[PDB]
Design a protein. Structure first.
Ligand code: E8X
Ligand code: E8X
Lengths: 620, 620
């Protein structure tokens, strides 16, 4: 279950397989299996980690449907592999993959945004090894994210009443038809690596939790005493594990020796005096060092953690007992050449932009991000809402057992990967599923999501609040959203409805706010905004102008400032990003307050000035 | 002398040190040395590899002058380090660096675009190692690239006659003053890695040359026989090395065992029947495998190479005996977030754009590029002119011994690194130095550059032609350029002079062409173009419009097509790129035929159509 990021130390080594691989496109529903047996014929170059779609302008890889095949060779010294457990890890392959090593099928995986690995100890040999990876980009009615098995893409224009259109449609080239508003970037989007552990016994998983804080300082910089718990899982085979707690300076401030009891497991609690707490805008990280004992050490792992509590109380969101207010946006892993490919330079920059904006948070819309970004936010004091790729869902999916299982696969997987990050304060189990309507549809939606709500709570040792991001719907017939720990709403009053009329938009908003006032749950925006082309200006700003985008946030935020139970504003979006082409997408989605190149539109400056005057704690 | 790229095989392992490091700014001319002794205080994150300048929007790192300090920790299993020679390699640190390991100064390096390494075998220890790297971005009268010690930036504006301006200047914040037109991106721009070799004896360098081709086929796909030479250098300490030549399928097609004689060296020749030649647009690569013999193998290195000849004959540039014509551009390593940071995704994409454009070549303006790009061009059949960072030079530099030595270091270093790449057909020893004028100035320039021309020839075992890229000058008083193997000229008739008048530009051009016609050397463009803002249009295109850029190349190329001795068109630039700010730089240099995001302007489409109709061989 544990999927600790591969680590190098005295017991373990990591061998990265990133770089420029060989690459071929294949078929709509197949690929040549014999390609795993020998070097790819006439291969293209393809850098990895990265989406393949924008790495070859001779081809139209954005239009590709079906399989592609990656391949490379590598060689490692025999003295490294001797007596070690050898693991091949894929941080992400989007969306599905078959993996071959030296002609042997290692296995397969579905889920484009969570890591998977294989024990390759017996599959490796000396000299050059041949690694072949087939990647499938197809989406449909049983995938997460959800595709349409027929019809149009989201927000799609159609003239079905024309006979000629209906006929041409039946013979059109097959394409992925997303039920979501971001381009279907595919391939080896994140790192690939080989790593080693000891074979006889090894650390397989670690969970650290903040159980209780005693006497938190007025500024919440410290607690007189903090009780943390550990749970270490072992694989392999009077054994013990040593656990050392390191402060920010590397000074061991606590240490205990725990018994391993059989799924070998060691667990217990540790008290930390005058513990330094993790807060938004004021991060502090400790290291839990686990060392498996035989002065020699058998195995070791260093796990970063932060000491903080998260608790919903009434209409407040408490971090270290203080009333928090979210300032931020939904993001995307999206950039030009890389597509959805992970880029830590850009991740480092984006975190700096978040500070520049005086935001304090974001949501991983609409999929778990690369692991390195969570590490980055841990040390930079940025709060995260962590979200599974359950986007584009409706009643057709709720009746499908395969979807329910893939959805459970996403939640346990996300939480298994991300549980130790202090920056994560809440889980999101879906973005904009169908929740409303008449007859049995509301109850059907409820019955699908409630056990996923329970699963998220049961899976997280820290027991963080769980939410579901609600689309702009009939909130009076939706019976699911109001049962979440925090009500997270996506609203586009004045853009997709009452278009351009900000008075009417605010009037409509206030009517729904009057509704949520009575539900008595904490409420925040997770999306709102307006497409904006930088350089379009007006004295009286109309839709798509920079001025209108500024006016939009100015009018809307003035209304939510009047509601004490409204605990956060996360807009849409951080930056412009790529989408499937269509009549409402001007080179993608232009609702970013920054351009795709991370340059600030007028609204960004206005939001920066606003957020500078709003404290992380005690605003409401 | 040798700088083989680190390789993993049964005798060798590479441990990458890339990732998110710790980072602090320091002083204009110092940094706290005690930072090497302990973790950096309050560090920022900084991705490696990448320029640091665009990775933090809270700071103005583009305006930073002086030192910065990088730091990270790392640990490797003791059993892997055991008995091995341990090498720490920096692919590039721009511009100068002091490197510390565990508080010990390892040494320093000047030169921002070439790799350097340290033997750290004795500095390493078990557990966490602390790696601290100080990087100096400062440029001046003694650096390559050349900076100004006072005054303005390249094409910088001033009103020196105003007393108020003169005074304020003396109190202005100190800044790097480049004598070049690209932004001074700095930091750990390329990869950092630790690698191992055998300690007792190891391969230190490998050089492969194509000595002679016998009976080349009409299409130059093959030669009846190819005579290649190898030269292997060893370090450490009747010993022998086995050399196997692998074809594109991995089949050993030739093999010899050579004796090692002590400066341990093995050298000889190998005849290959029906050898497959490397050509532009039709690459073929062999592998030279060298194995140090004790059936066991001591050490091994696999060196890719290609079999082709390059010869300047009269006014022709012969590759495998056929008259080649350059189609291409000067490039830059430049992109939005990475700066000058290497990005293999972008390199793969750019290589595809070159094919899309039907170009066949480019120049590494104005510095050696990342090693991976040459590997990429080796397999994709793109020809390269390789250039050292000798840009911004004038008479003030020719009299400076430190500059002369740094210039020699770069020339020997570039060639030592890049000698084995078949894609490289020519060396460039400077871009736009001062060469013309009255008095002793022309002779002084000649006396400075002539021994560098000789050095490039002496350093290169393949003995490729050598050039110097000449600025738009008084070609009648210039006595240096005409002595190069190929005349490479940068001309901006109709842009920087005779502005907008294309009839007059072509008239002036033809006049300089009449001059070069008599010199009787082969001549090519290495720069020509016009700043162009995408989206600016006109029915009668004026400067900065997409139409003017198209008209510009159409009129100019029509004139050079009339000259049989004119053997190439490399324009400026491949893509828009970042510069120091100024009144002629609209968000950088806009002479790209592509935008900075790699999108094609009107001129790119026109050039694509023209180049599609121009063959690699026999156009002239
Ligand atoms: C009001 C009707 C529904 C609005 C839908 C708004 C959409 N939500 C989910 C995001 O992934 C989309 O990018 C966003 C949008 O189109 O910008
Ligand atoms: C006509 C004399 C001046 C020509 C100077 C042209 C310059 N050459 C070298 C390149 O690095 C510059 O970017 C280019 C330019 O400014 O775009």
């Amino acid at each position: 279950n544990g999927m600790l990021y591969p680590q190098s130390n005295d017991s373990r080594i990591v061998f990265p397989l990133d770089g420029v691989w060989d690459f071929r496109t294949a078929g709509e529903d197949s690929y040549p299996a014999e390609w795993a047996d020998a070097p790819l014929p006439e291969p293209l170059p393809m850098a990895v980690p990265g989406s393949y779609n924008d790495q070859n302008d001779e081809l139209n890889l954005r239009a590709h449907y079906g399989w592609v095949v990656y391949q490379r060779s590598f060689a490692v010294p025999s003295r490294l592999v001797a007596g070690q457990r050898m693991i091949l890890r894929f941080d992400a392959a989007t969306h599905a993959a078959d993996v071959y090593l030296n002609g042997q099928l290692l296995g397969s995986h579905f889920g484009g945004f969570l890591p998977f690995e294989f024990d390759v100890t017996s599959a490796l040999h000396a000299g050059e090894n041949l690694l072949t990876v087939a990647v499938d980009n197809r989406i449909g009615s049983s995938t997460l994210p959800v595709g349409n098995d027929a019809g149009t893409a989201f927000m799609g224009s159609d003239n079905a009443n024309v006979p000629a259109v209906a006929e041409a449609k039946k013979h059109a080239r097959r394409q992925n038809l997303p039920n979501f508003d971001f381009f279907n970037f595919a391939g080896l989007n994140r790192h690939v690596e080989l790593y080693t552990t000891p074979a006889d016994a090894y650390i397989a998983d670690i969970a650290i939790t903040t159980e209780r804080l005693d006497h938190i300082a007025g500024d919440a910089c410290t607690a007189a005493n903090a009780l943390i718990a550990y749970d270490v899982t072992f694989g392999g085979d009077g054994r013990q594990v040593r656990i050392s707690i390191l402060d920010g300076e590397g000074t061991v401030v606590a240490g205990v020796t725990a018994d391993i009891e059989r799924t070998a497991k060691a667990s217990g609690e540790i008290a930390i005096r005058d513990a330094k707490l993790w807060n938004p805008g004021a991060a502090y990280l400790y290291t839990a060092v686990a060392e498996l004992l035989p002065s020699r050490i058998i195995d070791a792992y260093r796990q970063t953690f932060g000491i903080r509590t998260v608790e919903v109380s009434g209409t407040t969101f408490l971090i270290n007992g203080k009333p928090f207010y979210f300032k931020g946006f939904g993001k995307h892993e999206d950039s030009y050449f890389h597509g959805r490919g992970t880029d830590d330079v850009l991740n480092v920059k984006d975190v700096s932009l978040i500070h520049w904006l005086h935001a304090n948070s974001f949501r991983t819309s609409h999929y778990p991000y690369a692991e390195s970004m969570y590490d980055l936010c841990d040390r930079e004091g940025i709060v995260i809402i962590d979200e599974v790729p359950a986007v584009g869902m409706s009643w057709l999916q709720y009746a499908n057992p395969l979807v329910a299982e893939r959805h459970r696969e996403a939640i346990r997987g996300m939480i298994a990967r991300d549980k130790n990050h202090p920056c994560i304060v809440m889980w999101s189990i879906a973005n904009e599923p169908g929740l409303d309507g008449d007859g049995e549809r509301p109850r059907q939606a409820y019955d699908y999501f409630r056990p996923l709500y329970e699963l998220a709570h049961a899976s997280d040792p820290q027991n963080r609040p769980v939410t579901l991001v609600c689309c702009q719907n009939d909130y009076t017939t939706d019976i699911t959203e109001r049962t979440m720990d925090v009500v997270c709403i996506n609203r586009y009053y004045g853009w997709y409805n009452l278009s351009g009329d900000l008075d009417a938009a605010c009037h409509a908003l206030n009517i729904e706010l009057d509704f949520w006032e009575n539900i008595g749950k904490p409420v925040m925006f997770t999306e709102y905004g307006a497409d904006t082309i930088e350089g379009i200006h007006g004295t009286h700003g109309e839709m798509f102008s920079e001025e209108f985008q500024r006016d939009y946030y100015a009018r809307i935020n003035a209304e939510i400032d009047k509601r004490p139970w409204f605990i956060g504003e996360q807009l849409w979006n951080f930056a412009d990003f790529a989408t499937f082409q269509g009549i409402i997408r001007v080179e993608g989605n232009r609702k970013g307050i920054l351009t795709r190149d991370r340059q600030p539109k007028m609204a960004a400056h206005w939001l920066r000035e606003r957020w500078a005057g709003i404290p992380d704690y005690g605003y409401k």
